[PDB]
Amino acid sequence: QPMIYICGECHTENEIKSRDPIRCRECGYRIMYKKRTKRLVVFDAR
Amino acid sequence: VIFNRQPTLHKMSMMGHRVRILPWSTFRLNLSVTTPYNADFDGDEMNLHLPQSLETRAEIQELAMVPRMIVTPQSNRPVMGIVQDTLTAVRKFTKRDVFLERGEVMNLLMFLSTWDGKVPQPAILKPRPLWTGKQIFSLIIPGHINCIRTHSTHPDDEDSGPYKHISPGDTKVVVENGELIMGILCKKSLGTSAGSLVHISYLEMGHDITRLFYSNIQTVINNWLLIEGHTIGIGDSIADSKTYQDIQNTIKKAKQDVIEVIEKAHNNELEPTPGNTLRQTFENQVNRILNDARDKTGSSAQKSLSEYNNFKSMVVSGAKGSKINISQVIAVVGQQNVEGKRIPFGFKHRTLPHFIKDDYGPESRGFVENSYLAGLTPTEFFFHAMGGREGLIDTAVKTAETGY
Amino acid sequence: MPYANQPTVRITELTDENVKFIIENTDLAVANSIRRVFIAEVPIIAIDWVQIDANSSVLHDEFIAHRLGLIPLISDDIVDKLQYSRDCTCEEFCPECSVEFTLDVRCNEDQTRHVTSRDLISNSPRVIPVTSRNRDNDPNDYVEQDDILIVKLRKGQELRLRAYAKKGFGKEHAKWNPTAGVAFEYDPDNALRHTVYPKPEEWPKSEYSELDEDESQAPYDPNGKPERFYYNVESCGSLRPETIVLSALSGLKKKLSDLQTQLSHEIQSDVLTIN
Amino acid sequence: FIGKIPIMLRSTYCLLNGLTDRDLCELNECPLDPGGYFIINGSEKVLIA
Amino acid sequence: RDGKLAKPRQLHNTLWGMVCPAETPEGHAVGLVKNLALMAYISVGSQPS
Amino acid sequence: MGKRVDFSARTVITPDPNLSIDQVGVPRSIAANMTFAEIVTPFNIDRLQEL
Amino acid sequence: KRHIDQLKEREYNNYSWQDLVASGVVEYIDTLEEETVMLAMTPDDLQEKEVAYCSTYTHCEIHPSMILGVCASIIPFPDHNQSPRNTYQSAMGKQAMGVYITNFHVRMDTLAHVLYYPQKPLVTTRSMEYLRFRELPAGINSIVAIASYTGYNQEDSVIMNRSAVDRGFFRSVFYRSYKEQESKKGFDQEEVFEKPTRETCQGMRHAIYDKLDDDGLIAPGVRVSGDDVIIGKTVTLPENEDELESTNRRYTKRDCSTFLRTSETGIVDQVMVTLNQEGYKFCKIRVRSVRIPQIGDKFASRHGQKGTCGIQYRQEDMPFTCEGITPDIIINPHAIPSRMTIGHLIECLQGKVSANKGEIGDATPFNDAVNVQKISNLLSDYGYHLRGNEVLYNGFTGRKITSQIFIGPTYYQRLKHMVDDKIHSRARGPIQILNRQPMEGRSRDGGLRFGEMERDCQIAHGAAQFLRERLFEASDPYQVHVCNLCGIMA
Amino acid sequence: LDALPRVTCPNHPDAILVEDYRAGDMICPECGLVVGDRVIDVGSEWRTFSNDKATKDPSRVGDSQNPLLSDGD
Amino acid sequence: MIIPVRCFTCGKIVGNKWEAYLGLLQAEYTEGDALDALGLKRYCCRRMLLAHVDLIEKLLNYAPLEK
Amino acid sequence: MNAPPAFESFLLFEGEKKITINKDTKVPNACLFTINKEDHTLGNIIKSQLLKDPQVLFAGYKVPHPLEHKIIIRVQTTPDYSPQEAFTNAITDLISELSLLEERFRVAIKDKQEGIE
RNA sequence: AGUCGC
Ligand SMILES: [Mg+2]
Ligand SMILES: [Mg+2]
Ligand SMILES: [Zn+2]
Ligand SMILES: [Zn+2]
């Protein structure tokens, strides 16, 4: 469920885990950067 | 596999090699084959083809393989000889003053390949063990390869001096029974010159042992280099107060003499040389003066170089650059010119707006007084860029036409 | 054996920061190899695994991981109690072969926050922290000792991660350099003529050349050999300078004794047939 | 209305032309960006003299 | 383009403080693509009236 | 008369003095990706079986 | 000088360059008019004059080093260099990487290289101030020795201090942005961003669809590689025109999803979803990759000396001096004399004095400073050899090196062009259908051309079977039946 | 051989046929025998412009003229 | 960007001297002396601190530290 | 990418052994020791301890290729004394010098100094 | 196409 999408500026979640238009509610922007995985990823310090 | 490069100007540009697997991501090449490919490592790509049968692998191994591409039929002299840094280190190493302790010889012996295993007796037994440079080199030279002469560097005399009885001087390169008897090695001995040592190994003992001989020489000399070192610094670009005064004074003599030729021309006292016009004569005469000035001063700069100098060691070895480069760095850059003649009057009868109309004097029209060390004055700088552009453009235009 | 050349040591000068000393009656190769050991072979503790929960900072993830990888670790407490990841039986990491750190910070204030190693904390007992006032109620205070600066943050940015430091040595990665600097010098009057000065007057005499306090400059001695090596080991602080030298000598002894045992194993196990 | 003409970036007809260092940092545009080039379908297109 | 040696490739005398002396490609287009000098400026045009 | 070929490779080149004159050092990725077609004999069969 | 005092005053006054033009003390001169003026080089010369040259001047140069264009001004002491040497630097300086604008973290540029720790140059030209080059540096100050050391560095390559690349020297981040559109596009065919499944779609390359999110595109922070499919686009197509069920399976829609074929490793940095100018749901996704300087990456000083990193050594094996300040790069001494790039050498000596004094150094070309002897003299006051050399010890056997090596700072650039992108090999790839011969670029994983000229070379080799192998059996071999009674293939 | 809705594994009736695009081969998951006549999507294949010029397209031996609006271009 | 922890050349830790450094320039402008008080004798460590540009302060001004 | 993992520089491989001894046939009484996963730090020191020994005729080491962790040591002795024993003794001797160096150092630190720990 | 690499 990709029901995240941090907004253009209000940074509120978008809750658009479907086919509806990607307009952020409350906030006018429609550029939606995507939130990180809960997945763990390691970096060796090297 | 056969590896190659483009453009493939001639058969030596594409040759068979054996792969040897290493870490990281680039093709590694034995430095000495750089010249027949005309590569550098300034960023050049190379392409490799792997044959796919025993018949083609046989055909490459027998015909195209690099120890067999050594003496080219392009001009019956070797295609490859010792290059770059090793070549300067070989010059430095064969000089008669080099001596090694038991430890350094054992270390060099250890890097050699065909070494019989018998440490030769040091040329000096007492007061302490010492091996000379030439001596250790004699272990590398194959079975009995034997040259002569090939001394012809700028060391000794333009020939009559050595006949004044064979005061060994110290520059002839004599080898016998495959053992180096005397004299420094250089481009003239090891280079791709028709009469060279590498030529005699190939011609005498066969291709394979010569192939191991290139490998063997480059490796031993490079380790010695590691203890010896080599560098270049402003120390190499500096002469003395006396040379520098004499350089200025000699340019002052030349410039004043040009003004004399201009005054003779304006006075109309001058007469043309037969077969030419008055401008051509004036121009022939001023050009003869500024070149002669340049060469006299260059020859002065060559005279002042101390023997320890790193800069003189690269030119004299015959590693990179020439005598003329030393002149430009130390004494004077010299005349600039386009299409042969002096910088044209691109403006109305001028070269730059900085000058007065009609100024044939050497500075307003071309000739730069300063050296690369002193820096070029603004005008001198721009006229130099005009002369450098000719060199850039010619490279591109010539490249297309020869290609066709 | 009836030719082994003793080796006598002398400490000139010592601080908590550097240790400067002279070795005499030894070979250059010994003097040399010992130097290569101070750099490469002294083992130490540095961050090796970084797992990042959140990164909203003005910096990419690996960049935070990297800078963090270089933060110096007080290994004054013997790293010998703590094993290597490979020899240690456990799956992955463990308390006996690893040290655990956590960093969790966020900028809620209307003021630019600086994130510094003091914010990184040892889950491990205070015998292996970051080099920031964990031991320094130092009367010689430098009104900072912020140790290092991991990143900078503005309001609303957060950084949450955990990291597992390991023992490893300088031969594998530069973060495990025990040295800040390692000066080495010998024969400072160039007596042996191992280097040749053209115009020998232009060179400045060194701090040990004083022996010829005279301007006579570099007297020759042809029967000589190398003697009297001068050192200046400087520590980055991740390890006491005296301890770096002593551990180096031991590591090199352990390394040599192992080569001897391996060589013994060549004739003891599967007897050699060289004769 | 007859049509839409491309604006050269940071000219007096751009929105960027009056703003200080603070507004431009705010708008997400680098104060040090020279401007002077068109933006066409998301590509920076510069004309050549 | 591609086969024609010429004098409009060589730095000309008049390019003094007008166009950079040494900032033109090293490829086949050498000297044809030039780069404006630092102090150089270019007239925008005006009515002769 | 000139066409693209298969079994071909290209990289940047760097110098190696410890290398013989007719050797060329080649990266692991190119060595693993490139192939040579060997034919099986009744004796080297055991080595190929290993490969 | 009173006009100058107003220009100092500008820090809090309305006085400006336009006021300066209004005093009529400066003029604008086009190239046609510049032909007829008598133009003094510098106030100095216009002053001393009495019977020295002439006295009719009408204009004077505001500063002679202004004749340089933008890239040529980065290069310090350009007048101590051989002229074409300056031209190669103007190309390469433009070629280097670094930070290219500050707001770059939110720009979706197709391809970018950002350096970790750019430094402003120790040696500078006064013009560089006007380039904001202090704000956006392109490289790093190396400690450099011109030595031969191990011969790895011959012919324009360089030995590097591997611990220096480890402590983070010249590290870079690299970004590529992949972009994709959901076109409504066709008559009845339709595109959707969604996770494909081998049950109900056509295509299914063996590459892993499992990293795709349920949205149809991956998510930030997940590690990606050479075969990963980053965005899941599908094309419902056939519709149902092939009568009957046409269901078996995988019949509803074909696959055409977008996948890695250029960034053969990295992390997903960002995933950005929006809608583009056409109004379609649109996507951009960025991957950050980190390039460590390695054998094959290409570098250059500012005086047009490019060369490849030929090997890297530990900080143990580098040669070292006194304190043991081991050099990060060793550039081969045979490089200088034939190219005459003497200015590079002044920069070490200028660089050594600036760093050591703590004051940044001037290297603007045309001045009265006589700059070679006087820089050397400062350096001696600091205590080094007055002309730069140092006694460096051999890093291996600890011995002293017989001569001295020239060492000091120099700004160096890591250039765009890096080995990991160029490397290439083919072992039977795709085949183009106009020729049934191998592909051309790496973009289609192609082979290399065995050109007209390479062919000619093999004839001279008389290796005919190999010539026959390469122009035939290795690329495009075909069997045709021809009639004997007439030579026609049909 | 007219029967091939992508089916041609001689030993056992096909299950699926996977495309090893880079090696240019058609592979059968539960054995190993190729069935090639490789074509990794002929639309990718025409893209034989690269070092050669491209956005005037000399390689343009084929315009598209958007036929899905008309009856046939 | 930010100051690199541990000088490239030799290895001496150095990020720790940055904040102290900017305070010195506000005080004693003698950059040589300021570098000297921090203890960066040898010039590679000195170029490290001497040549760096602290780009992070400009970067901090973009409104979203969250993307 | 083709760069080895950096730990592979010093860890012995599971199918390898630390030292290997092969005879030379060019000259009588001589040996070639292969030291794997070692460098100049080890190779250079063992060369110097052997050259100190007066029964040794020849001693030298060479790292065959820089990218490849391995050194070779050639040693040759008089017929009356096996070359292997000189090598073993040369290490033990060296072990003894370093041990005495360590004892003298700790004691020298033990000399009236303060802050020694 | 153009840019660009040698
Ligand atoms: Mg090159
Ligand atoms: Mg190149
Ligand atoms: Zn002659
Ligand atoms: Zn647990």
G478 touches chain H (CB under 8 A): no
Structural domain boundaries enclosing B139: 84-228
Let me know: does C236 contact I13? Beta carbons within 8 Å. yes
Q: Which domain CATH number covers B96?
A: 1.10.274.100
Three-state SS at G125: coil
User: Residue B168: is the preceding peptide bond cis (ω within 30°)?
Assistant: no
- Residue G229 has a CB neighbour count (10 Å cut-off) of 22
I29 touches chain D (CB under 8 A): no
Distance in Å from the first CA to the final CA of chain H? 34
> Residue G337: enclosing H or E segment and its boundaries?
helix G335-339
Q: Which two tokens stand for residue B121?
A: 């007796």
Amino acid in position B194? A
CA distances from G453 to B6, D35, F5, G130, G459 (A): 9, 47, 15, 49, 10
CA distances from B255 to B268, B368, C109, G257 (A): 20, 12, 75, 76
Instruction: Please tell me what DSSP assigns to residue H9.
Output: -
Q: How many residues does chain C have?
A: 275
Q: Specify the fold of C44-174.
A: RNA Polymerase Alpha Subunit; Chain A, domain 2 (2.170.120)
Contacts of B86 (CB under 8 A, 6+ apart): B31, B217, B218, B221, B222, B225, F17, G151, G154
Structure-token match 């320890």, residue found: B308
**Pairwise CA distance, residues C59 & C54, whole Å:** 12
Q: Which two tokens stand for residue D18?
A: 């009056």
Number of domains, chain I: 1
Amino acid in position J7? F
Nearest to J41, CA basis, from J98, J99, J103, J86 = J98
Q: Which chain G residues are Cβ-neighbours of J43 within 8 angstroms?
A: none
What are the strands, taking DSSP E only, across G337-450? 361-362, 389-390, 392-393, 405-414, 424-426, 448-449
Nearest to G220, CA basis, from G261, G177, G267, G178 = G267
Ligand nearest to the CA of C93: 4
Q: Which two tokens stand for residue C81?
A: 């109690």
Task: List the single residue in D with minimal CA-CA distance to G100.
Answer: D33
Nearest to J113, CA basis, from C232, C77, C139, C13 = C13
Let me know: does G431 contact G469? Beta carbons within 8 Å. no
Three-state SS at G366: coil
Please give the backbone phi and psi of residue G382, each rounded to the nearest 5 degrees, phi first. -65, -25
Nearest to H42, CA basis, from G76, G186, G435, C216 = G435
Parallel, antiparallel or unpaired: strands G39-40 and G59-60: parallel
- Residue B242 has a CB neighbour count (10 Å cut-off) of 9
DSSP of C40-89, one letter per residue?
IIS-EEEEEEEEEEEE-SSS-HHHHHHHHTT--B---S-GGGS--TTTS-
Binding residues of B for RNA: 5, 44
Let me know: does J19 contact J12? Beta carbons within 8 Å. no
Instruction: Please tell me what DSSP assigns to residue G473.
Output: I
> Residue B210: enclosing H or E segment and its boundaries?
helix B207-228
Q: Which chain I residues are Cβ-neighbours of D26 within 8 angstroms?
A: 63
User: Residue B7: is the preceding peptide bond cis (ω within 30°)?
Assistant: yes
**Pairwise CA distance, residues C139 & G480, whole Å:** 95
**Pairwise CA distance, residues I23 & G469, whole Å:** 73
> Residue C160: enclosing H or E segment and its boundaries?
strand C158-168
Three-state SS at E47: coil
Nearest to B381, CA basis, from A11, E21, C270 = E21
Domain C1-43+175-275 bears CATH identifier 3.30.1360.10: yes
Give the 3-state secondary structure percentages of chain C, helix then strand then coil, rounded to 5: 25, 25, 50
Ligand nearest to the CA of C97: 4
Structural domain boundaries enclosing I55: 1-67
Distance in Å from the first CA to the final CA of chain D? 31
H55 annotated as belonging to a binding site for a ligand: yes
Amino acid in position G55? S
> Residue B242: enclosing H or E segment and its boundaries?
helix B241-266
Structural domain boundaries enclosing J40: 1-117
Ligand nearest to the CA of G331: 1
Q: Which two tokens stand for residue G68?
A: 């340089």
CA distances from C203 to C215, C218, I54 (A): 11, 11, 38
**Pairwise CA distance, residues G46 & G53, whole Å:** 10
User: C95 in the Ramachandran plot: left (φ > 0), alpha (ψ -120 to 50) or beta?
Assistant: alpha
Question: Which nucleotide has the shortest C1'-to-CA distance from E25?
Answer: K4
**Pairwise CA distance, residues I35 & I27, whole Å:** 13
Q: Which domain CATH number covers A36?
A: 2.20.28.30
Let me know: does B132 contact B123? Beta carbons within 8 Å. yes
Q: How was this structure determined?
A: cryo-EM
- Residue C114 has a CB neighbour count (10 Å cut-off) of 15
Strand partners, A43: C50
- Residue B128 has a CB neighbour count (10 Å cut-off) of 12
Question: Which nucleotide has the shortest C1'-to-CA distance from H57?
Answer: K1
Q: Which two tokens stand for residue B302?
A: 């060559």
**Pairwise CA distance, residues C169 & C39, whole Å:** 9
Strand partners, G124: G362
Q: What angle do CA G259, G263, G264 make, to 5 degrees?
A: 90
**Pairwise CA distance, residues G82 & B371, whole Å:** 10
E1 C-beta less than 7 Å away from strand K:
yes
Distance of alpha carbon A15 from its chain centroid, rounded? 9
DSSP of G153-202, one letter per residue?
TTTTEEEEEHHHHHTTTT-EEEEEEEEEE----SSS-EEEE----TTS-B
Q: Using a CB cutoff of 8 Å and minimum separation of 24, what contacts does D10-17 make?
A: D10/D34, D10/D35, D10/D36, D11/D35, D11/D36
Nearest to G230, CA basis, from G270, G278, G183, G199 = G270
Number of domains, chain J: 1
**Pairwise CA distance, residues B110 & J11, whole Å:** 27
CA distance B22 to chain J (A): 7
DSSP of G196-261, one letter per residue?
--TTS-B---SS-GGGS-TTSB--TT-EEETT-EEE-EEEE-STT-SSS---SSS-SEEE--EE-S
A11 annotated as belonging to a binding site for a ligand: no
- Residue G331 has a CB neighbour count (10 Å cut-off) of 26
CA dihedral G432, G437, G440, G444 (to 10 degrees): 50
**Pairwise CA distance, residues G321 & G314, whole Å:** 16
Distance of alpha carbon G243 from its chain centroid, rounded? 57
Where are the alpha helices (H) located in I1-67, listed in sequence order?
18-27, 31-37, 43-51, 56-59
Q: Which two tokens stand for residue F42?
A: 């009744």
Binding residues of C for Zn(2+): 88, 90, 94, 97
Task: List the single residue in F with minimal CA-CA distance to G432.
Answer: F4
**Pairwise CA distance, residues J12 & J15, whole Å:** 8
Amino acid in position B122? P
G418 C-beta less than 7 Å away from strand K:
no
H51 C-beta less than 7 Å away from strand K:
yes
DSSP of J88-112, one letter per residue?
HHHHHHHHHHHHHHHHHHHHHHHSS
Let me know: does B342 contact B334? Beta carbons within 8 Å. no
Let me know: does G436 contact G478? Beta carbons within 8 Å. yes
Q: Which domain CATH number covers I19?
A: 1.10.10.60
**Pairwise CA distance, residues I7 & E32, whole Å:** 45
Q: What angle do CA C12, C18, C23 make, to 5 degrees?
A: 40
Contacts of G380 (CB under 8 A, 6+ apart): G386
**Pairwise CA distance, residues G198 & B206, whole Å:** 65
Q: Which two tokens stand for residue J103?
A: 């004892």
Parallel, antiparallel or unpaired: strands G361-362 and G123-124: parallel
**Pairwise CA distance, residues G111 & I7, whole Å:** 30
Q: Using a CB cutoff of 8 Å and minimum separation of 24, what contacts does C83-88 make?
A: C83/C167, C84/C166, C84/C167, C84/C168, C85/C48, C85/C166, C86/J11
CB spacing of H25 vs G428 below 8 angstroms: yes
CA dihedral C153, C158, C162, C163 (to 10 degrees): -20
Closest residue by C-alpha to C1' distance, nucleotide K6: B44
Task: List the single residue in G with minimal CA-CA distance to D40.
Answer: G277
Structural domain boundaries enclosing A33: 1-46
CA dihedral J94, J98, J103, J109 (to 10 degrees): 160
> Residue ranges of the domains in chain C?
1-43+175-275, 44-174
Contacts of G156 (CB under 8 A, 6+ apart): B40, B41, B42, G305, G306, G307, G308, G332, G335
Please give the backbone phi and psi of residue B338, each rounded to the nearest 5 degrees, phi first. -115, 135
The residues on B that touch E, with CB distances below 8 Å, are: 338, 343-347, 351-353, 381-382, 385-386, 388-390, 392-393, 396-397, 400
**Pairwise CA distance, residues F26 & B183, whole Å:** 39
Parallel, antiparallel or unpaired: strands J30-36 and J70-77: antiparallel
Distance in Å from the first CA to the final CA of chain G? 94
Binding residues of F for DNA: 4
Strand partners, G290: G173
DSSP of C219-239, one letter per residue?
---TT-----EEEEEEE-SSS
CB spacing of G221 vs A46 below 8 angstroms: no
Beta-carbon-side half-sphere exposure of residue G392 (alpha carbons within 13 Å): 31
CA distances from G271 to C61, G176, G207, G265 (A): 15, 12, 21, 16
Beta-carbon-side half-sphere exposure of residue G440 (alpha carbons within 13 Å): 15
**Pairwise CA distance, residues C260 & C266, whole Å:** 10
Where are the alpha helices (H) located in chain D, listed in sequence order?
21-27
Pick the CATH number of G431-490 from 3.90.1800.10, 1.10.40.50, 3.40.50.1100, 3.30.1360.170: 3.90.1800.10
Let me know: does G329 contact G293? Beta carbons within 8 Å. no
**Pairwise CA distance, residues F28 & J8, whole Å:** 15
